[PDB]
Design a protein around this nucleic acid. Structure first.
Ligand SMILES: [Mg+2]
Ligand SMILES: [Mg+2]
Ligand SMILES: [Mg+2]
Ligand SMILES: [Mg+2]
Ligand SMILES: [Mg+2]
Ligand SMILES: [Mg+2]
Ligand SMILES: [Mg+2]
Lengths: 52, 110, 95, 287, 24, 54, 54, 152
RNA sequence: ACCUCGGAGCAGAACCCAACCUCCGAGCAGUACAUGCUAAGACUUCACCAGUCAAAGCGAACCUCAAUUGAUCCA
C-alpha cells in the first residue's frame, strides 16, 4: 500500500529524513527544514530502502 | 621533613599559622602532625553519620570536652553529644565542625 | 564472573558492562535507552528525543554493576578533554 | 599523669592479662545447636540450599538488565588516553610556605616527587602533572615551574608575581625515570634521550600562548603582554631581578633531567660519573 | 547621614494597573 | 499627591501640590501652603500615579 | 528624575529591579532513577570544574 | 651546557639571545587603547560562599585624558544610567568566582563600550519584544495634542 | 481450546485484583512534514527493561483514532 522513501536536500548536502508515500504515485518534492541552513529548501525522493 | 622557615608576617597565606612559644597553662594540650598542621579532621561511618575527630588530645580530656561543648552550645542551641575517650587522644563531635574548631584551636594557643 | 581464576586467583570483570555502561566516581552508572536507533519512522519526535538522553540507573542495578566489576573500574580518571568531568563529583548532598 | 600513678602499683604486665579492645574481636558463628542448627541458616530446600545457583546476573531465562542495553562508545580507548594529575596554585603556595618546595631552584617533576605534593604513577597512562588555577587569589611565590599542562589563568597568575611557565612533554619512560631516579641509577643502564611529542601535540607544544618548550622565544613577550592586558596588572620585567640567571633555565630538550646529559651512566657506589667517548655514541645521543 | 535617604530594601506598589503594564 | 512613590512608609504617601482658599475660579489669588514638586518615580519601580483631589 | 533627585532633594537616586523567586527543585536523592544527565547541573552551584585537595 | 640538534638555538637561528624571550615590548605597544591602571580604582567588596566574586571598578569619566571628546560624550549619553552622582562610571561583573576573570570581563566590557561609542554609523537591530509597547505608548501620548499655545 | 495488546460486568463512588467467566476488535488509516533544536516539573500496567504530558527560549506563518507492536548481537 504505502512506501517509505528518503528525501535528499538540494542545498546543504548531508541532511536527509524519511517520510511515507503512496506506491502508485510519482516522486515527492516537499518543503522540509534544514538545520545547516536554518531555512526552507527543496527535497527530492532518492533511493528507497523500505517496502511496507 | 625540615622545620618550616620563620616568616616575617606570621599571618602566612593559604591558611597556616605556627604554634606560639611556651603556650598557655592549660590542663590539656593539642600536638601537631608531621606537616605541622592542626589535627582537626572529619570522619564518616555509614552514609549519613557526620562527625569530627581531634586525634591529638594530651592531658585532661574532660576540660577540653567541656570547653568545646560550651563553645558549640551557642552555635547549635543544644548540647553536642560527644564521646570522652581516654584510652586514645580522640574526641568525636557530632556535626560538621572543622574550620570552626581549627580557628578556635589557633586562637586559643595551639 | 569467575571469583577465583586458575592462574592469578583474582577477580574478573564483564566486558559487556564496560562496553554498555559508564561508571562515575560518585557511584552512578550512565546507560543508554534501547531502541534509540531502530524504527525511528513510527515514533514521535518527543520519543526520539527522550530515547537520546543519558539516563541513570537505579540502586540494585548500580550494585549489580559494581559487583560485576573490580577495584580498577571504581577509581578516578583525570582525562585532558573529559566531557563527563563535571559529573564525577557530586555537591550539595544532604543525606 | 594519672596513668603512671595508677600503673605504679598492681601486678606486672606480662602475657597473662592480654585484653583485646572490645568491639574489634567478634565471636565466630558456628551452625551447631538449636538457634543456628536445623538448616544452618540456609532456608528451605532447592537451589538455595544445595548451592547449585546460577551466576551473578542470571534472571532465570529472562534477558538480564546488562544485556538488553546496546553498546556505546563510553570506554572505547580508555587505556590509551593521556591522564594528568591536577595541581592547584593554592597547594603549591602551601608547599612553598611549609618549606617542602624551595622557591630558589627550578621546580619540575622530580622536585615535586621529592616534596611529595603530588603522586605521579608511572603506569595507568600518565604523561605528567597538569596545572590548576584554583588558587589564583592570594598567591605570592615568584618561582619558575615546569608543568606539562598549564591553563591561561594559571600562567597569568604565575607571571603576575614574576614566574616562568615551561610546557614540556615526556614519554612514559621519561616519567618513570624522573619519578624515582635512585632505582634508575641503581639499574645500570645509560640515560636515554627524550622522545618527540605525538602527532596530536606538535601544534600545542610549539605554540606561544601555551609556553611550549619547542616554540620560538620571539613570540613569548607578545603573549605575555597580551595576557597582562587581558587579566590586568602591570607586567613586571624579570631582567632587573637578582634571580635572572635562575629563571632562564629553559631546560634544553633531549636531557630529561637538568645538569646531566643523555648517555651518562650514573653509579651510586663510588661517586664517579663516566663519560661516553667514541663518535657514534655522541652522534646518537646528540641527535 | 541624610535623613531623606529612607528607601528600604523592599519597595511595594499599591496600583492594580502596574503588573500588566510591565508585561509581568 | 502620589499614591505610589513613598519609599519609607508603604501605606503613607508624599505631597506635591496643595492649595487652599481658592476664590471660585480664581486659582491665582488664594494663599499658598505647599510648593509644587514634579513627580520622582524610581527606576526599577513600576508605574506610579498621581491624583488631583479637588 | 536624575536632575530632580540632584537639584531638588539633595540625595542619591534609588534604583530597583523586578526580581523573581528562585525556581522549585525537589530534594536531591542519592540515586536519581530515570533522570537525564543534566540532573546534576540543576543543583550545581558554579558551572566550573572545582578542585579540592588537588 | 648541553645542546642537541633539536635545541632552541639551532631550530631558530634568528633568536639566540639570553633575554630575547623576556624583553618587554613596552616601547612598541603603548597605544591609547591600553587603559591605564594607575587612574582606576578597583576594589573587591564581596566574598560569597553560589560562589561568585564581585569586582567593582570606578573612575571619573569627566577627567579621562585617554579618551577623545566626541567618543566620551557619546558614551556618556548612551550610558547615562551607570554614571554615579559624582561622575563615576561604576562597572561590575558577576560571572566567575575568581577576581582575575571578573577583572578581565570588566576590561573587555570597557573595551567594547569604547570601540562601539566611537563608531557612530552602527546599524541598530530592530527588536520587537520590549520596545514595541513603549513606541505604542509614546505614539498614543503624542496623538492627544490639539491645542494652540502654551508656554512654561 | 489458547500463546501479544485494548474495551464492556464480575471489580458498582481514589487505585489494584484472577478464571478453560459472556461478548467486540487490533499487526492500520483521509490530508499539510517547524512530525525542528534545547529545557523546570509528573504519571508510570503493582520490580526492572519500556511508554506518555508539559513551563520557557531560538527558530515559523499568524496533528485525529482505543490495542494498532520488536530489545541484545550482527549486517
Ligand atoms: Mg572513616
Ligand atoms: Mg531437607
Ligand atoms: Mg521449594
Ligand atoms: Mg545446574
Ligand atoms: Mg525465553
Ligand atoms: Mg511503577
Ligand atoms: Mg512552547
Amino acid at each position: 500500500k504505502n512506501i517509505l522513501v528518503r528525501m535528499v536536500s538540494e542545498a546543504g548536502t548531508g541532511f536527509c529524513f524519511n517520510t511515507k508515500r503512496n506506491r502508485l504515485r510519482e516522486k515527492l518534492t516537499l518543503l522540509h527544514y534544514d538545520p545547516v541552513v536554518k531555512q526552507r529548501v527543496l527535497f527530492v525522493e532518492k533511493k528507497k530502502i523500505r517496502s511496507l | 621533613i625540615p622545620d618550616p622557615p620563620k616568616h616575617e608576617h606570621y599571618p602566612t597565606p593559604s591558611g597556616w599559622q605556627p604554634p606560639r612559644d611556651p603556650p598557655p597553662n592549660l590542663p590539656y594540650f593539642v600536638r601537631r602532625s608531621r606537616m605541622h598542621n592542626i589535627p582537626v579532621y572529619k570522619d564518616i561511618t555509614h552514609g549519613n553519620r557526620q562527625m569530627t575527630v581531634i586525634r591529638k588530645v594530651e592531658g585532661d580530656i574532660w576540660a577540653l570536652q567541656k570547653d568545646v561543648e560550651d563553645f558549640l552550645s551557642p552555635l547549635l542551641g543544644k548540647t553536642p553529644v560527644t564521646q570522652v575517650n581516654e584510652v586514645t587522644g580522640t574526641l568525636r563531635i557530632k556535626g560538621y565542625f572543622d574550620q570552626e574548631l581549627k580557628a578556635w584551636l589557633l586562637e586559643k594557643g595551639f | 564472573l569467575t571469583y577465583f581464576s586458575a592462574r592469578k586467583g583474582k577477580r574478573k570483570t564483564v566486558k559487556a558492562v564496560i562496553d554498555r555502561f559508564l561508571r562515575l566516581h560518585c557511584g552512578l552508572w550512565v546507560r543508554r535507552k534501547a531502541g534509540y536507533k531502530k524504527k525511528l519512522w513510527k515514533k514521535t519526535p518527543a520519543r526520539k528525543k527522550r530515547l537520546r538522553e543519558f539516563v541513570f540507573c537505579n540502586k540494585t542495578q548500580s550494585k549489580l554493576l559494581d559487583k560485576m566489576t573490580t577495584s580498577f573500574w571504581k577509581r578516578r580518571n583525570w582525562y585532558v578533554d573529559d566531557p563527563y568531568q563535571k559529573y564525577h563529583d557530586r555537591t550539595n548532598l544532604k543525606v | 599523669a594519672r596513668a603512671l600513678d595508677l600503673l605504679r602499683g598492681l601486678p606486672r604486665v606480662s602475657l597473662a592479662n592480654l585484653k583485646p579492645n572490645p568491639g574489634s574481636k567478634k565471636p565466630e558463628r558456628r551452625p551447631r545447636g538449636r538457634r543456628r542448627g536445623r538448616k544452618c541458616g540456609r532456608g528451605h530446600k532447592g537451589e538455595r540450599q544445595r548451592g547449585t545457583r546460577p551466576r551473578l546476573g542470571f534472571e532465570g531465562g529472562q534477558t538480564p538488565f546488562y544485556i538488553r542495553i546496546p553498546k556505546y562508545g563510553f570506554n572505547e580507548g580508555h587505556s590509551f588516553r593521556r591522564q594528568y594529575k591536577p595541581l592547584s596554585l593554592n597547594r603549591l603556595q602551601y608547599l612553598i610556605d611549609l618549606g617542602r618546595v624551595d622557591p630558589s631552584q627550578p621546580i619540575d617533576l622530580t622536585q615535586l616527587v621529592n616534596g611529595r605534593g603530588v603522586t605521579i604513577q608511572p603506569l595507568k597512562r600518565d604523561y605528567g602533572v597538569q596545572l590548576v588555577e584554583e588558587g589564583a587569589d592570594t598567591f605570592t611565590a615568584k618561582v619558575n615551574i615546569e608543568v606539562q599542562l598549564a591553563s591561561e589563568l594559571a600562567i597569568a597568575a604565575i607571571e603576575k608575581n614574576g614566574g616562568v611557565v615551561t610546557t614540556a612533554f615526556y614519554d612514559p619512560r621519561s616519567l618513570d625515570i624522573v619519578c624515582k631516579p635512585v632505582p634508575f641509577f641503581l639499574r645500570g643502564q645509560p640515560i636515554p634521550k627524550r622522545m618527540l611529542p605525538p602527532e596530536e601535540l606538535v601544534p600545542y607544544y610549539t605554540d606561544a600562548k601555551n609556553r611550549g618548550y619547542l616554540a620560538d622565544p620571539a613570540k613569548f613577550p607578545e603573549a605575555r603582554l597580551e595576557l597582562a592586558r587581558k587579566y590586568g596588572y602591570i607586567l613586571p620585567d624579570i631582567t632587573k631581578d637578582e634571580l635572572f640567571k635562575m629563571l632562564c633555565t629553559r631546560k634544553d630538550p633531549r636531557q630529561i633531567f637538568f645538569g646531566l646529559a643523555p648517555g651518562w651512566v650514573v653509579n651510586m657506589a663510588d661517586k664517579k660519573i663516566l663519560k661516553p667517548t667514541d663518535e657514534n655514541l655522541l652522534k646518537y645521543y646528540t641527535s | 547621614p541624610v535623613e531623606n535617604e529612607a528607601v528600604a530594601p523592599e519597595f511595594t506598589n499599591r496600583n492594580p494597573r502596574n503588573l500588566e503594564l510591565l508585561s509581568v | 499627591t502620589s499614591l505610589d512613590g513613598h519609599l519609607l512608609e508603604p501605606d503613607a504617601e508624599y505631597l506635591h501640590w496643595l492649595l487652599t482658599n481658592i476664590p471660585g475660579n480664581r486659582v491665582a489669588e488664594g494663599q499658598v501652603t505647599c510648593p509644587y514638586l514634579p513627580p520622582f518615580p524610581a527606576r526599577g519601580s513600576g508605574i506610579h500615579r498621581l491624583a488631583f483631589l479637588l | 528624575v536624575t536632575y530632580i533627585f540632584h537639584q531638588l532633594l539633595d540625595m542619591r537616586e534609588p534604583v530597583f529591579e523586578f526580581v523573581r523567586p528562585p525556581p522549585y527543585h525537589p530534594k536531591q536523592k542519592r540515586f536519581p532513577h530515570r533522570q537525564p544527565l543534566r540532573y546534576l547541573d540543576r543543583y550545581r552551584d558554579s558551572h566550573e570544574p572545582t578542585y579540592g585537595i588537588y | 651546557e648541553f645542546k642537541s640538534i633539536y635545541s632552541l638555538d639551532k631550530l631558530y637561528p634568528e633568536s639566540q639571545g639570553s633575554d630575547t624571550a623576556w624583553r618587554v615590548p613596552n616601547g612598541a605597544k603603548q597605544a591609547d587603547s591600553d587603559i591605564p591602571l594607575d587612574r582606576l580604582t578597583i576594589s573587591y567588596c564581596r566574598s560569597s560562599g553560589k560562589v561568585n566574586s564581585k569586582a567593582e571598578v570606578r573612575f571619573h569619566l569627566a577627567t579621562a585624558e585617554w579618551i577623545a571628546e566626541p567618543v566620551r560624550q557619546k558614551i556618556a549619553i548612551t550610558h547615562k544610567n551607570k554614571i554615579n552622582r559624582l561622575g563615576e562610571l561604576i562597572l561590575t561583573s558577576e560571572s566567575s568566582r575568581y577576581q582575575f576573570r571578573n577583572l578581565a570581563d570588566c576590561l573587555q566590557k570597557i573595551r567594547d563600550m569604547i570601540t562601539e561609542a566611537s563608531q557612530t554609523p552602527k546599524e541598530p537591530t530592530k527588536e520587537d519584544v520590549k520596545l514595541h509597547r513603549i513606541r505604542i505608548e509614546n505614539m498614543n501620548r503624542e496623538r492627544l495634542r490639539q491645542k494652540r499655545i502654551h508656554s512654561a
